[PDB]
Amino acid sequence: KNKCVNFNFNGLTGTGVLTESNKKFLPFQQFGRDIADTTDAVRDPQTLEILDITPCSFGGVSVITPGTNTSNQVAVLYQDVNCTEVNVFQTRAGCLIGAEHVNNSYECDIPIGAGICASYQTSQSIIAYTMSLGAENSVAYSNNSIAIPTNFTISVTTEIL
Amino acid sequence: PVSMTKTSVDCTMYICGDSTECSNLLLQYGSFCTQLNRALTGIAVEQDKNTQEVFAQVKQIYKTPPIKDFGGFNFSQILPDPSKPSKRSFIEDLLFNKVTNGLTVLPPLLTDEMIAQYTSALLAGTITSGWTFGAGAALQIPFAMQMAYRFNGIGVTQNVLYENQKLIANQFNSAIGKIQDSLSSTASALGKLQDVVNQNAQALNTLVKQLSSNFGAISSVLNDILSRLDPPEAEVQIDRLITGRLQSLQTYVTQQLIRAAEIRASANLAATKMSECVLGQSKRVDFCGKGYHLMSFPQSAPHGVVFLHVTY
Amino acid sequence: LIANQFNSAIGKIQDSLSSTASALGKLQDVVNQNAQALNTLVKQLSSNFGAISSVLNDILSRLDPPEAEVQIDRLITGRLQSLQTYVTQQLIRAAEIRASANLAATKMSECVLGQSKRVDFCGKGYHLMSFPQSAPHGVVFLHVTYVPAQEKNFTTAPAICHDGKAHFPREGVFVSNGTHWFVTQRNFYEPQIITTDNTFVSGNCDVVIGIVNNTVYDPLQPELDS
């Protein structure tokens, strides 16, 4: 149990991790199915125990990199995995290797997911952080205070379509 | 609706899940699967762009002062509620509570807490600074006088507001209470968001169920074909399964592309409404609610946005 | 000052476009998407799809018609599915591009050919005018917008009392530098003396919340006195 094995029960075969499940089969039932017709629990033919099948962990391997024109140092994101199945950072978006966790929040440069971004900042190395939404501000609101601009700036912005 | 669910699917594991012979047969088809993954990744990047366009419209994260003298207008049900763990409003909490094989679901780049922070910033800016924070630096203005400006923007002189301020504040509070009660009572309101969620769920479920179809082969189980037939005939059967499952992926990806185009149109509409309707005051008829538009308040929602259109 | 600011802004646009190339990522994305689709379409010609050779001429020169038929059928199936995929992706992408083109046509009509009051539709700020510029497979708009710059705190009031009559400003807002009260246009500080030509009277002083007291200078009284 608790190990990625290529099992072969009575007639049904697969790969996964077998774990002690708490499902309650009926005495004549042999294996369970998910909502999408995928087998997830099997009753062991020798000892009448119910084993939950979880797929062997997998996911994409995403490489985070600044431009090679800038640097050739990269970080790797192992999506939706435990960091033990692989300077190692566990995030909601996966396991991040090669990037230094920072408590500062900056403007997002390279999006990773679940609020984590990455950037190449200084002696320079890859950093990972909770991205900043903006410079937090409080308006001086009161029931008799108004702000009126005494000057203006004519700005020309470029929009491309 | 603003965004879909960022779903990515791996061919080799979907079509030929952990099978050497099947993977070798799948190699003959070229870059079909590279381009499937490319299409799905483009969709997911577009989803993040949708959310960022709709919500990340405010430069600074404004916050309402602890003193709530808004001329009698009561925004307690839409402003953030620190008592809850996630800094969401009462109505945002109602909205969030009302919505219920190589397949990965990538998390959105902005978390729900960040979306709520953006909507909080937009509410604080609109309340404490009118439409000025969209044009430039947020300029404070008393909320009664801002409502006077909005009344003047629909062709009613500001003396009407100043003389009927108490009645107007009571009517606005009553309207907010009605919104609360409807969104607590009936779930038929958020059908637009629940339909997107359900459509995506049905699409993925059908995609998985397609792995139980023969497509003409002797069996839909691939190891069973391998253990039953000799390689020359197992090749034919596995090619049948590969053609069927590859067609299932192509159908799913095409359908997701079309649905994502629809969602991107909806998200562009939401971005336009946030810009012209929350950050300003719209003279476009019926674009911002049925009536003469006064102001609008955004609320985040599961994979979407909710606008509270205050109209005269 | 305004002419100088506009000229400086155009110069800064020149500097940005001659400095950083990341501005035209929107056009480059279209070009790269189409090129990648065509590259995939071409590379799909070199796949076997289960046939003995990816090259049609080799199968034709190597097999008798009965078996060449089977092999060519396999290749035809594969390549026809490749074109089906390419055309479907192109139709979806062309719908997206047509949405962008409709948006750009709307921006030209409402943004160059007129002055838009829609917020953030024509650049961030108060839209003044927009100048179109052609670009490879696209259009570039230079949105000249008015942005308020230097704001000063003021004390404000919804109305003022003169003789039991409540004066509201006609087009502007009552402000006070601390002692004297003025009426100013709400987007640019130019104080003005509160007169009956700047305000209008409606109702009495007992209703408006936040009303203050000041003298509304009647122009006609000094003329009558003189």
Ligand SMILES: *[C@@H]1O[C@H](CO)[C@@H](O[C@@H]2O[C@H](CO)[C@@H](O)[C@H](O)[C@H]2NC(C)=O)[C@H](O)[C@H]1NC(C)=O
């Ligand atoms: C198959 O045989 C094994 C042993 O030959 C059985 O295992 C025993 O099961 C009983 C009841 O479950 C236990 O009390 C014993 O402790 C088990 N022995 C061992 C060594 O583990 C098993 O139950 C048999 N199963 C069937 C279906 O006949």
Ligand SMILES: *[C@@H]1O[C@H](CO)[C@@H](O[C@@H]2O[C@H](CO)[C@@H](O)[C@H](O)[C@H]2NC(C)=O)[C@H](O)[C@H]1NC(C)=O
């Ligand atoms: C409004 O802002 C402009 C821009 O900062 C000010 O003009 C500047 O004035 C200084 C002092 O004379 C000059 O050195 C700059 O060259 C000017 N800028 C430009 C772009 O010409 C202007 O003085 C401000 N007006 C007020 C009333 O404060």
Ligand SMILES: *[C@@H]1O[C@H](CO)[C@@H](O[C@@H]2O[C@H](CO)[C@@H](O)[C@H](O)[C@H]2NC(C)=O)[C@H](O)[C@H]1NC(C)=O
């Ligand atoms: C704004 O409205 C809310 C909701 O009606 C008010 O909160 C209620 O206040 C009463 C009286 O203090 C309490 O009995 C309720 O339990 C409160 N309800 C909730 C949901 O908190 C709030 O007092 C109003 N604010 C003002 C300034 O009147």
Ligand SMILES: *[C@@H]1O[C@H](CO)[C@@H](O[C@@H]2O[C@H](CO)[C@@H](O)[C@H](O)[C@H]2NC(C)=O)[C@H](O)[C@H]1NC(C)=O
């Ligand atoms: C508010 O503005 C008024 C009007 O400009 C100021 O009063 C004038 O102040 C100047 C110099 O401070 C004097 O030369 C004038 O004679 C004053 N005119 C009147 C009618 O009093 C007033 O000082 C300003 N208040 C503040 C706090 O700046």
Ligand SMILES: *[C@@H]1O[C@H](CO)[C@@H](O[C@@H]2O[C@H](CO)[C@@H](O)[C@H](O)[C@H]2NC(C)=O)[C@H](O)[C@H]1NC(C)=O
């Ligand atoms: C503005 O001026 C009026 C008139 O002088 C003030 O009204 C007076 O209020 C006091 C106390 O409320 C009464 O004792 C007087 O009788 C009122 N005047 C009259 C003629 O009846 C008013 O209070 C002033 N407002 C401010 C903010 O100073």
Ligand SMILES: *[C@@H]1O[C@H](CO)[C@@H](O)[C@H](O)[C@H]1NC(C)=O
């Ligand atoms: C790297 O970027 C700089 C701009 O910062 C550019 O001038 C330079 O040409 C780039 N290098 C290459 C090899 O393109």
Ligand SMILES: *[C@@H]1O[C@H](CO)[C@@H](O)[C@H](O)[C@H]1NC(C)=O
């Ligand atoms: C992933 O595995 C590690 C090691 O067992 C564990 O500490 C971590 O909690 C796991 N992930 C989650 C989300 O629990």
Ligand SMILES: *[C@@H]1O[C@H](CO)[C@@H](O)[C@H](O)[C@H]1NC(C)=O
């Ligand atoms: C970041 O915050 C965590 C949580 O308190 C703390 O343990 C860690 O030392 C912090 N890192 C730095 C560099 O201060």
Ligand SMILES: *[C@@H]1O[C@H](CO)[C@@H](O)[C@H](O)[C@H]1NC(C)=O
């Ligand atoms: C106006 O006053 C408030 C509170 O005194 C202050 O926070 C704000 O910076 C002031 N505005 C300006 C433009 O200085």
Ligand SMILES: *[C@@H]1O[C@H](CO)[C@@H](O)[C@H](O)[C@H]1NC(C)=O
């Ligand atoms: C503004 O609030 C303060 C604080 O209580 C109060 O003293 C003042 O009368 C209020 N003014 C208006 C116009 O609401």
